[PDB]
Enzyme design. Structure first.
Site, PDB file in Angstrom:
ATOM      1  N   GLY A   1       0.730  -1.213   0.017  1.00  0.00           N
ATOM      2  CA  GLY A   1       0.087   0.235  -0.035  1.00  0.00           C
ATOM      3  C   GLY A   1       0.754   1.330  -0.125  1.00  0.00           C
ATOM      4  O   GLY A   1       1.945   1.365   0.196  1.00  0.00           O
ATOM      5  N   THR A   2       0.197   2.469  -0.147  1.00  0.00           N
ATOM      6  CA  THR A   2       0.759   3.762   0.059  1.00  0.00           C
ATOM      7  C   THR A   2       1.186   4.132   1.315  1.00  0.00           C
ATOM      8  O   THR A   2       0.611   3.664   2.161  1.00  0.00           O
ATOM      9  CB  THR A   2      -0.552   4.657  -0.450  1.00  0.00           C
ATOM     10  OG1 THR A   2      -1.210   4.475  -1.396  1.00  0.00           O
ATOM     11  CG2 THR A   2      -0.254   6.116  -0.599  1.00  0.00           C
TER      12      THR A   2
END
Lengths: 247, 246, 234, 553, 239, 244, 246
Positions: free
Chosen positions: A31-32
């Site tokens: 993820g980010t």
């Protein structure tokens, strides 16, 4: 002679662990990168937002979500799972406010949020949430910052980091909490959050990005969670730039 | 929708119930004996630690004031059946007839509960065999065994669990049709003395009787019509006094 | 020779955190004909290529209306694109009856995400096999949402969905400032889309029957063009 | 590429996937069986795995994965020999991870076939080490054993650590003194902490698990001490008495009595000590020996295959007879003092069972000293010459007073089993477990003459001939084997002669008295006495001529 | 799991039929003036309570009885359902239930447990017996499939084939109940796996008329009455 | 892998529910040891606190739960499964107090919770929780009390129960103290000496000294179960350090 | 021959790596295995026709009518008849009458076609989705005031196209090729009849006659009618002289 224990969710492997909850954290590990910094009177959230085409509309694609009003929420990994866990949190706090006529304690929103996520680890008819959440706020006991897993595990933190850049981010968060044992201010946490985020983007140097930041400080924003923009954002961008261009 | 459990194996066997009789065969032994004027049911208490207080783990249980039960197998399966068995006695029979059900009607109802767990999707059969023992005005004294199948049998004496084949051989060798309740107690204490895994005394051993009525245990006087409990659970001092007569 | 154990059920995770059935649901978008969505400050547009199975066969429907202020195009699964579009029209009517607004298109996005993520999380179904471009206009201006069936969405100035769409996408990306300014002259925003979609036609040609155009901005509500309505736009 | 693959296989061993662990262990033992676990570096101070091997491996793999054939790949023989020599410097960190994974597998719910396979790979690794790498692994296998966190569950895989310790002691007799001494100190401590002082039957309690570890480690280590046992023999005998005095739990009696079996067995057994891939740290094959001579003509060379054997010493047999007659007299005298004043107490039975159990494990192990033909004395061409101690001729056997002393004890233990059968059938005729222990005592007493039939097939600290034949056999190729496999084949040969030696005989009145008690117990009304007794009767009929006539009569 | 074999045959029904083929033998015989039921009971347990009131043979109402081959746990669920239906018919019509209506009632429930895949079938075969005015003395059989058939004499459970052959050669349409007593005892003694027949191994019953014109009476025999028909018949295990 | 036998709660040919045996390995996923003891008029629970990351707030790490006014528990197992079981135990005590008009006994809550575990131990679509629950109170009927409950649904009373991956050393030292002292409780008239006694046993068993932030404590007297803060723990650690 | 199997074949409610649902795709291949049915839409009527397989003389015709009335303005041709084909048609009948009594007017043919496709998406009678197929191919023909003469191929998928002309059953390729080579927006009803008979002749293998072929049309004036054997015979005679006139 086979490993069918990882195909289904209501099942312990031989060691006694849910492998689908161990694969759901791998979705978070893609993820980010995002962080939350806890101050002496508030909580700061900061995120590196990857811009995969110029078409991405500006200041309308947003990774920081405002749960209720006195709490903030940034999540990493499968984006649809964070949206679902962000909408349920909003329902949870709205119910407590209509019934008890007061804002929900952050320790209590965390417990209700951590029982909904554990319930999806019980039954083979559903899969775990492939997202981790950082959330936190100011209530009548002051500043709380929580981080919650696909497993339903949650604890309170001084600073928390998730997503792809988490290694470099955790090492810098440890430097902060070691230099500032008593704690850092609201304005010192936004500047230092930008430094941590730029330093985490050094893993992906070719994938250009935006920085998005938010307050929740008893003195700077009257205890409400609020966005960080304009001059205080540019003062943070310049601190991040002058320390990463460390010549 | 390809949904059931305990389906038939090609040799005409039910399979899952067979595996449920292997769980019963692994439990601490329990046994029962019927005499001319009373009945006895008995078992050992196995401690998970010597810090455990086995005054809390009762294994021998009152179903109605004239009916007792004991198990071998999985104790958790036995705590849940005993409380349904108690509810059944009150709701099906006491609240219609103003008197408790016989030991053949309550055994049928316990067995009906265990049969429904064999013929189901979603549920495994029970891991317990139950010995149910009691008295009734027209049947007299009785002892029955109930297995994971929902099959029930009337017995003169029986045993279930690890030591059960050696216990059943001793019960055949010692049983006769003129035993009295003090005799049957001695035979049951002798049988557990061979099957015991741990120490043998009044604290490790569970023992109950359905015998004469005990008007002391009714806890109120003035109504002779009410004779008072036939079921009595031997006190740890009585067990140690009888274990001094051994 | 390279069997995947973890793509049978929508509820399984790969050892690397992938939901393979959901990534396969995206590969169904590449099975449709190209549609292009784009917006200025005041208008959003959809232009769609429609297939047939034979020269005797009526061309497939591609643009659907949910309300006067928004609608969608569908390059993916047609019968499954009727499930989402029914639910979106049901939600537009629910907003006018139960809240007396009309459903702002950001809120429409959140509701499609919720519905698709539910399919993605529970046993005894499948992911949606369809990608939607939703276009709308409301109090916050001209809006364009790419719904992807993993249960996600994004606000975008323009995009293309369907087979061979990297061409049209790269033309919008090379010609963006051109369409974002256009505003009060909506026919050049239509010709901007018609150039973009023309890049995905590999010497196929637009025809009066092969192409459909829809536009929704300011007062002019959501409208669709077919036949000679799209002849002035060839 | 191979030592890079070996450490990648060892680091990938898994506690959840028992099937992947099985296929990794196949690869690890196949690497180990062909390769010397040896540092080949010539004091070349420039060599490193990270600076020579791993660069060339990345170049070859990248060439091969581009699409090119390995025939296109060019490198100097100088770089290739440096990268090979550097490949051999990586073995000590691989073994650190290996021992660490072995201690994690002690707690896993494994199948017996995989536990056995893990013991085979651990021992094949040890036999492939030079004395340098092995000394490191031996000091690594004993440090982790004392300093573990690894015996937690209800029923641990004690074999996965205790068979490796016994294999250390098979290769080096010098390790045994400190290992045994330290074990018996840790045993005495657990008995003082109260292990084995709470009764249970058919289960080892979780308070006893460390005592069971040190006792099973002691049993396995003792079975491999051979002549190193002479040094601390007095200490072990006085400790054995203490262990029989101080623990009385029935499940622990079977374990504590097997200590004497393993002690006696080492003294009188004939077996291979040396299974090494290359011997002595001192044989003529050049350091260019990375395949185990398998496809060479000199694999068969007598100087390569100079094995070394435990052949029993006169000092070890004199210790064996001394342990036997001391521990049997001890148990006879202790049960005879309980035969006065019987009790129906649970203690009284478990005490009787202990000494009877101890008298069955003094007959095991010393089993190699008994002789089926003793009853004929008061031609005979045996084609199979199982290695006996007193000689193959009648003339030799009876001209040694230790042959008569051994037979005297066998008879005196057998007469005690009849004196016990009349005691148990008169006082305790319902009590099944002490009849099962008596029937096991009688089975061992009838069967184990000049050979060992119990403890023959259970996993032990010798490498398995069928496992190493499955690894090294290749169709239409003749004896494609290494020195380890030739060694265990020579061990299997002598073992066959010992188990092919015929025990059929005619009775001496004591066998008839005891066979009549087996026939009585076979006719007994308790399933748990008659089913064992009928199995014992089948075995005792094999031992005696005309025995079916006596049974049907 | 209630799916067809490729021949159009049901595996579960065949396996339930294998199960009842071990399950102890029962004979029924329809005389001109009554029905006889008899069943052979494998008492391998000394401590099992013989002189328990039932195991193989049961009353369904005042004029209907059954014998059971199969699982007694399964049989008792059907037996109670039949008892409830008999009394619910008597309550509705004020008249005793006709035997065909009840035998086929238990044949319709047992077919349902063979069609739905969540249910295992019932491992039971019933030899029904009874009287009603519509027909007279009736003898029926029903099996795990839900098939049912009318008979003059029949066996179920173990050793069916030997028993059917012995019935066939000695049965007469005009025989009396005492001839059917004799025949059913002879047949079981000529079919038994146990060395000789005796009163505890045997369950017995009759459906006679008696002396009084309105009567039909169902003596399910107690052990002492069975000892009398044993010593009268010449099976006579007597001092 | 044997098919469904290992993946749902159904009997193996042996008769083993692999769903329950594996859930007992889940309880040791915390690497935490906890200890509980009865005094004269109190019952006490001491639990090892792990906070490795500098970034945690130690005020949010807790395996001790207040179940009602008078009853409390320690949990051994994953915190998501310990918070689920705590929330049930809170609801079960509340509904009992309403229905029967008196405070839920510890014995009754341990039985009620153990009956719930028997469901997941029989229903194939229900998995046993990965936790051991250690309830303590001062019951007016049984004075100070300890009741432990496990994934198989087996519960029993105790006078010094303990759960952890090093629990055998603590238990073996407890058994040797109760063997020499022969009373079934520790004879201190005030809870401060009981907690200090319970921190002397966990030091002696686990081979390590404890800081005030590396230790947890519980104090169950009549009318109150409550948790100690780090300075109340340091008063006891100071009194241990003043004695030795 | 050589085998060409994938791992994605036989997947139910599953996408391949391309997104291919292989249960609904393998169901769409059955439009080559049925008996031939053809539809021809025009400005004058929709001509439907099916090849008859010759029956046993004992099977009476109304058992196997593969041209059917849904309503006076709508009819189905089927290439193959199943219980599900009569289920689709009797759902279409019940849908057409329930529309006429609720909305006081005749059903649009598109809306009827969509309603039989909605039955297929439900799999008969949880989110209705297109995962598994139902029934068989219908050619639905009809006439309404808003969209005129319409021929729909309704597929097992719950999707359809309107066609100008469509062939289904074992002539599909050669028929559809001759239809697309030959169809006009200038076809008269007469020429649509001779065209369907010329197409039928060419696929059928047999000599075309009034006992192996069946015709019908939907006309707005006359409604739906199946044609008389005498009428198909005089049309077939007319085809003979039209090709002899070359």
């Amino acid at each position: 002679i086979g490993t069918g224990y990882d195909l289904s969710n209501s099942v312990f492997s031989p060691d006694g662990r849910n492998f689908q909850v161990e694969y759901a954290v791998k979705a978070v590990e893609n993820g980010t990168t995002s962080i939350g910094i806890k101050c002496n009177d508030g909580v700061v959230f900061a995120v590196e937002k990857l811009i995969t085409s110029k078409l991405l509309v500006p200041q309308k694609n947003v990774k920081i979500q405002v749960v209720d009003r006195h709490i903030g929420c940034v999540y990493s990994g499968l984006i649809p799972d964070g949206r679902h866990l962000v909408n349920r949190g909003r329902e949870e706090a709205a119910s407590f406010k209509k019934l008890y006529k007061t804002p929900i304690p952050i320790p209590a929103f965390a417990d209700r949020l951590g029982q909904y996520v554990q319930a999806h680890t019980l039954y083979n008819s559903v899969r775990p949430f492939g997202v981790s959440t950082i959330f936190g706020g100011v209530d009548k006991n002051g500043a709380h910052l929580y981080m919650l897993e696909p497993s339903g595990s949650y604890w309170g933190y001084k600073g928390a980091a998730t997503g792809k850049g988490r290694q470099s981010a955790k090492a810098e968060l440890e430097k902060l909490v070691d230099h500032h044992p008593e704690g850092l201010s609201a304005r010192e946490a936004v500047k230092q959050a930008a430094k941590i985020i730029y330093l985490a983007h050094e893993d992906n140097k070719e994938k250009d990005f935006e920085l998005e930041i938010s307050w929740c400080s008893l003195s700077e924003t009257n205890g409400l969670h609020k966005f960080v923009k304009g001059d205080l954002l540019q003062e943070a961008i310049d601190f991040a730039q002058k320390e990463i261009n460390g010549d | 929708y390809s949904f059931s459990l305990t389906t038939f194996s090609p040799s005409g066997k039910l399979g899952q119930i067979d595996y449920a009789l292997t769980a019963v065969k692994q439990g601490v032994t329990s046994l029962g004996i019927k005499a001319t004027n009373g009945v006895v049911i008995a078992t050992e208490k196995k401690s998970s630690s010597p810090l455990a207080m086995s005054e809390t783990l009762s294994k021998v249980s009152l179903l109605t004031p004239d009916i007792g039960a004991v198990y071998s197998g999985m104790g958790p399966d036995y705590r849940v059946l005993v409380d349904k068995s108690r509810k059944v006695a009150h709701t099906s029979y006491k609240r219609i007839y103003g008197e408790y059900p016989p030991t053949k009607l309550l055994v049928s109802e316990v067995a009906k509960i265990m049969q429904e767990a064999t013929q189901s999707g979603g549920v495994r059969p029970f891991g317990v065999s139950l010995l149910i023992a009691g008295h009734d005005e027209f049947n007299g004294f009785s002892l029955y065994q109930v297995d994971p199948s929902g099959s029930y049998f009337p017995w003169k004496a029986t045993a279930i669990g690890k030591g059960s084949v050696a216990a059943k051989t001793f019960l055949e060798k010692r049983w006769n049709d003129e035993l009295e309740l003090e005799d049957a107690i001695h035979i049951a204490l002798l049988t557990l003395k061979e099957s015991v895994e741990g120490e043998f005394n009044g604290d490790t051993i569970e023992l109950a009787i359905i015998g004469d009525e005990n008007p002391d245990l009714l806890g109120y006087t003035g109504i002779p019509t009410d004779k008072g409990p036939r079921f009595r659970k031997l006190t740890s001092q009585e067990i140690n006094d009888r274990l001094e007569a051994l | 020779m390279f069997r995947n154990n973890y793509d049978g059920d929508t509820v399984t995770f790969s050892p690397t955190g992938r939901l393979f059935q959901v990534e396969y649901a995206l590969e169904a978008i590449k099975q449709g004909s190209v549609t292009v969505g784009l917006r200025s400050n005041t208008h959003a547009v959809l232009v769609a290529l429609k297939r047939n199975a034979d020269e005797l066969s009526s061309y497939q429907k591609k643009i659907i209306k949910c309300d006067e202020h928004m609608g969608l195009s569908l390059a993916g699964l047609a019968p499954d694109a009727r499930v989402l579009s029914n639910y979106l029209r049901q939600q537009c009517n629910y907003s006018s009856l139960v809240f007396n607004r009309k459903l702002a298109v950001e809120r429409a996005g959140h509701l499609l995400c919720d519905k698709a993520q539910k399919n993605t999380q529970s046993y005894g179904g499948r992911p949606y096999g369809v990608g939607l471009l939703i276009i709308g206009y409301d109090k916050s201006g001209a809006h364009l949402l790419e719904f992807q069936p993993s249960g996600n969405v994004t606000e975008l100035y323009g995009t293309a969905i369907g087979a061979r769409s990297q061409g049209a996408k790269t033309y919008l990306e090379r010609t963006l400032d051109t369409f974002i300014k256009i505003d009060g002259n909506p026919d050049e925003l239509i010709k901007a889309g018609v150039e973009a979609i023309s890049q995905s036609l590999r010497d196929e040609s637009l025809t009066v029957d092969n192409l459909s155009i829809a536009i929704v901005g300011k007062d002019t509500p959501f409208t669709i063009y077919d036949g000679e309505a799209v002849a002035k736009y060839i | 590429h191979i030592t890079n693959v070996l450490s990648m296989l060892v680091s990938k061993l898994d506690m959840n996937d028992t099937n992947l662990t099985s296929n990794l262990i196949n690869g690890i033992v196949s690497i180990a069986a062909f390769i010397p676990i040896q540092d080949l570096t010539g004091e070349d101070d420039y060599i490193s795995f990270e600076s020579d091997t791993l660069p060339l491996v990345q170049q070859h793999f990248y060439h091969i994965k581009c699409g090119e054939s390995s025939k296109t790949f060019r490198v100097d023989d100088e770089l290739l020999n440096n990268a090979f020599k550097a490949s051999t410097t990586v073995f000590q960190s691989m073994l650190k991870v290996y021992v660490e994974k072995i201690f994690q597998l002690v707690d896993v719910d494994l199948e017996d076939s995989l536990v056995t396979k893990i013991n085979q790979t651990t021992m094949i690794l040890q036999e492939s080490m030079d004395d340098k790498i092995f000394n490191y692994f031996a000091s690594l296998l004993q440090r982790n054993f004392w300093s573990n966190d690894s015996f937690k569950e209800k029923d641990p895989n004690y074999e996965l650590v205790t068979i490796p310790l016994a294999a250390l002691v098979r290769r080096n007799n010098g390790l045994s003194k400190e290992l045994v001494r330290t074990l018996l100190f840790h045993i005495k401590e657990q008995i003082k902490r109260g292990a084995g002082s709470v009764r249970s039957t058919s289960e080892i309690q979780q308070r006893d698990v460390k005592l069971v570890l040190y006792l099973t480690a002691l049993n396995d280590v003792l079975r491999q001490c051979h002549e190193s046992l002479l040094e601390y023999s007095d200490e072990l005998i006085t400790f054995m008495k203490y262990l029989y005095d101080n623990v009385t739990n029935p499940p622990l009696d079977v374990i504590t009595s097997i200590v004497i079996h393993s002690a006696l067995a080492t003294l009188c057994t004939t077996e291979i000590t040396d299974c090494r891939l290359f011997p002595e740290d001192s044989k003529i094959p050049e350091k260019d020996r990375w395949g185990g001579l398998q496809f060479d003509p000199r694999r068969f060379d007598k100087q390569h295959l100079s094995f070394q054997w435990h052949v029993p010493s006169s000092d070890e047999i004199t210790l064996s007879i001394s342990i036997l007659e001391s521990l049997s007299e001890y148990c006879i005298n202790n049960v005879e003092e309980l035969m006065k004043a019987p009790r129906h107490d649970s203690e009284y039975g478990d005490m009787i069972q202990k000494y009877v159990l101890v008298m069955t494990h003094t007959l095991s192990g010393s089993s190699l000293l008994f002789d089926p033909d003793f009853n004929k004395y008061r031609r005979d061409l045996d084609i199979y010459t199982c290695n006996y101690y007193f000689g193959n001729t009648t003339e030799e056997k009876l001209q040694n007073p230790q042959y008569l002393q051994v037979h005297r004890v066998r008879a005196r233990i057998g007469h005690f089993f009849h004196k016990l059968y009349v005691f148990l059938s008169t006082n305790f005729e319902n009590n099944t477990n002490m009849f099962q222990i008596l029937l096991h005592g009688l089975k061992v007493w009838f069967t184990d003459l000049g050979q060992e039939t119990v403890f023959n097939e259970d996993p032990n600290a010798f490498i398995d001939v069928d496992f190493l034949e499955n690894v090294q056999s290749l169709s239409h190729v003749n004896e494609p084997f290494t020195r380890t496999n030739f060694a265990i084949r020579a061990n299997s040969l002598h073992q066959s002669r010992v188990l092919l030696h015929s025990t059929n005989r005619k009775a001496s009145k004591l066998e008839n008295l005891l066979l009549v008690d087996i026939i009585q117990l076979a006719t007994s009304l308790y399933p748990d006495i008659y089913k064992p007794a009928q199995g014992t009767l089948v075995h005792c009929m094999k031992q005696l001529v005309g025995s079916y006539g006596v049974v049907i009569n | 799991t209630t799916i067809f074999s490729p021949e159009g045959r049901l595996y579960q029904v065949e396996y339930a039929l294998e199960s009842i083929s071990h399950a102890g033998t029962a004979i029924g015989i329809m005389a001109s003036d009554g029905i006889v039921l008899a069943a052979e009971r494998k008492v391998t347990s000394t401590l099992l309570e013989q002189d328990t009131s039932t195991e193989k043979l049961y009353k369904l109402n005042d004029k209907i009885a059954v014998a059971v081959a199969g699982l007694t746990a399964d049989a008792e669920i059907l037996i109670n359902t039949a008892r409830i239906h008999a009394q619910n018919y008597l309550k509705t019509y004020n008249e005793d239930i006709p035997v065909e209506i009840l035998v086929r009632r238990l044949s319709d429930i047992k077919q349902g447990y063979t069609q739905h895949g969540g249910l295992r079938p019932f491992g039971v075969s019933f030899i029904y017996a009874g009287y009603d005015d519509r027909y007279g003395y009736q003898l029926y059989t029903s099996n795990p499939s839900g098939n049912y058939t009318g008979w003059k004499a029949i066996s179920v459970g173990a050793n069916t084939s030997a028993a059917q052959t012995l019935l066939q050669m000695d049965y007469k349409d005009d025989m009396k109940v005492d001839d059917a007593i004799e025949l059913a005892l002879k047949t079981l003694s000529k079919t038994t796996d146990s060395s000789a027949l005796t009163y505890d191994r045997l369950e017995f019953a009759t459906i006679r008329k008696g002396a009084n014109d309105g009567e039909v009476y169902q003596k399910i025999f107690k052990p002492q009455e069975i000892k009398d028909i044993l010593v009268k018949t010449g099976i006579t295990k007597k001092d | 892998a044997a098919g469904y036998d290992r993946h749902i709660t159904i009997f193996s040919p042996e008769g083993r529910l692999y769903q329950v045996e594996y859930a007992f390995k889940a309880t040791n996923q915390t690497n935490i040891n906890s200890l509980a003891v009865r005094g004269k008029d109190c019952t006490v629970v001491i639990s090892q606190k792990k906070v490795p990351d500098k970034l945690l707030d130690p005020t949010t790490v807790s395996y001790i739960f207040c179940i009602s006014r008078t009853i409390g528990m320690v949990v051994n197992g994953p915190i998501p499964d310990a918070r689920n079981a705590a929330l049930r135990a809170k609801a079960e005590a509340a509904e009992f107090r309403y229905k029967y008009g008196y405070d839920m006994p510890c014995d009754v809550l341990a039985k009620r919770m153990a009956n719930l575990s028997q469901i997941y131990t029989q229903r194939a679509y229900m998995r046993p929780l990965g936790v051991i629950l250690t309830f303590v109170s001062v019951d007016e009927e049984l004075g100070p009390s300890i009741y432990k409950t496990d994934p198989a649904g087996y519960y029993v009373g105790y006078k010094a129960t303990a759960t952890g991956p090093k629990q055998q050393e603590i238990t073996t030292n407890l058994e040797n103290h109760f063997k020499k002292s022969k009373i079934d409780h520790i004879n201190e008239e005030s809870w401060e000496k009981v907690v200090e006694f319970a921190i002397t046993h966990m030091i002696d068993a686990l081979g390590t000294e404890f800081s005030k932030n590396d230790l947890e404590v519980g104090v169950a007297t009549k009318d109150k179960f409550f948790t100690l803060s780090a300075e109340n723990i340091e008063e006891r650690l100071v009194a241990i350090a003043e004695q030795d | 021959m050589f085998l060409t199997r994938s791992e994605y074949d036989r997947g139910v409610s599953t996408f391949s790596p391309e997104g291919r649902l292989f249960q609904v795709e393998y169901s769409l291949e059955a439009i080559k295995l049925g008996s031939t049915a053809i539809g021809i839409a025009t400005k004058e009527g929709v001509v439907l026709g099916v090849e008859k397989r010759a029956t046993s003389p004992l099977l009476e015709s109304d058992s196997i009518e593969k041209i059917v009335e849904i309503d006076r303005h709508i009819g189905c041709a089927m290439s193959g008849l199943t219980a599900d084909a009569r289920s689709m048609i009797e759902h279409a009948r019940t849908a057409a009458v329930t529309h006429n009594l609720y909305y006081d007017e005749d059903i649009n043919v598109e809306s009827l076609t969509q309603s039989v496709c909605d039955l297929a998406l439900r799999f008969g009678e949880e989110e209705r989705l297109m995962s598994r197929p139902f029934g068989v191919a219908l050619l639905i023909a009809g006439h309404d005031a808003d969209d005129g003469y319409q021929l729909f191929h309704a597929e097992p998928s719950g999707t359809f196209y309107r066609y100008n002309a469509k062939a289904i059953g074992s002539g599909s390729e050669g028929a559809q090729a001759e239809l697309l080579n030959e169809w006009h927006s200038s076809l008269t009803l007469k020429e649509a009849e001779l065209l369907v008979l010329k197409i039928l002749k060419q696929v059928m293998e047999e000599k075309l006659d009034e006992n192996n072929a069946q015709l019908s049309c939907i006309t707005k004036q006359d409604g739906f009618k199946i044609y008389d054997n005498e009428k198909t015979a005089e049309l077939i005679k007319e085809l003979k002289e039209k090709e002899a006139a070359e």
